[PDB]
Symmetry: none
Subunit: 164 residues, 2 copies
């Protein structure tokens, strides 16, 4: 098979999975151009740390109707952005839950910019994460943020790790 996916997506029309991929790859000063006519976009990334190295793809899949059999079989992590300023912010993730149950990825991250008392506050985000098996991450909290996403992905045992 091919290399693993970390599937990256967004439930907001005003922040894309591609932009989140740019922040993640930015942790190592990698600049990415995201303009492809392909409906799904794969960005290669060599995870390298003191334990192992692993080639993966950050797979930007804008909606569930773009999940092929091949993509589904490769998903080993799931990162999903939601708009916590909207009261419907968690409801907007609901369409991904059947797929997340099927994939059973060992890293599942729910990402917002900052929890919000008139939108989705910390308590409600945390209860959702308990029920569905996600970790809550804030990109701009009042490790955390994109560094925590990178940390969590570096602590994943990918199917193709090469141990040091």
């Amino acid at each position: 098979a091919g290399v693993p996916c970390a599937l990256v997506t967004s439930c907001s029309s005003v922040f894309s999975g591609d932009q989140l991929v740019q922040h993640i790859l930015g942790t190592e000063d990698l600049i990415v151009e995201v303009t492809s006519n392909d409906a799904v976009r794969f960005y290669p990334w060599t995870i390298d740390n003191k334990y192992y190295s692993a080639d993966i793809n950050l797979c930007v899949v804008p909606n569930k109707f773009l999940v092929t059999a091949e993509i589904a079989e490769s998903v080993q992590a799931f990162v999903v952005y939601f708009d916590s300023t909207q009261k419907s912010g968690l409801d907007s993730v609901s369409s991904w839950l059947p797929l997340a149950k099927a994939w059973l990825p060992e890293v599942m991250i729910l990402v917002c910019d900052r929890v919000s008392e008139d939108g989705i506050n910390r308590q409600k985000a945390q209860e959702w994460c308990i029920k569905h098996g996600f970790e809550l991450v804030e990109l701009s909290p009042k490790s955390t943020g994109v560094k925590r996403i990178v940390q969590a992905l570096n602590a994943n045992v990918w199917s193709n790790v090469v141990m040091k």
Copy 2:
């Protein structure tokens, strides 16, 4: 690791990046660039009747930028030269030790078209015989050109092919 098809150029007339745009048939490409805006990695999923393989087209402007990881991954080599100049083939000499050391099955010397006032067909062919390259003309007078490059790359046994 993920294979590289290393694409480069010895002439400012036509850069490795332009060569990739022509090989992939579009300018709208996902591309990962390093902090120094020098080595460009273009992901590409080859898919044919025999296999599917997700590789990188790696535009490496000069031999100094061939890291250990790039060197390890090179499984095809494509280099443009300016055939209108009598010194056109001399401009490629820098790459010969590395191409000798990588052992790629695809080694392609590319020009727009051979020229009797620069590097003509005989001299280009004699150079290709001595160093084990294949001569390709993008714009011949008479597969050829970019279609032949794509054919050769699809007939290469990458280290990560997924057989159909």
